[PDB]
Design a protein around this ligand. Sequence first.
Ligand code: HEM
Length: 87
Amino acid sequence: AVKYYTLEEIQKHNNSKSTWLILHHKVYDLTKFLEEHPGGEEVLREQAGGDATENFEDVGHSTDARELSKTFIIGELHPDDRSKIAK
Ligand code: HEM
């Protein structure tokens, strides 16, 4: 089942040691993906520790990329924090 993280938890995972981000209320651990992302490391770094949904959507991402992203899900944003960012 669901493992939840608050915004304040996720915020700490903002650097090379541990990079997490949020897309559509899911929490992604990208620590090892940074080196692999076709769009490069820096754009991810820029977003690390918070909601990156609109940047992810704005740039565009293929169905293949969206399927790939599910492999990094570690949990979901706590329900009480959903109103403090958009799904
Ligand atoms: C777990 C999440 C992510 C996955 C799996 C992922 C995967 C990919 C993949 C596979 C591509 C190659 C093109 C495509 O398939 O559409 C791509 C390109 C790109 N990604 Fe991501 N991405 C992720 C998150 C992000 C985020 C959050 C941003 C921005 C902050 C970003 C910015 C870019 C850029 C700028 C490109 C280049 C677009 C192009 O090829 O022309 N990505 N990403």
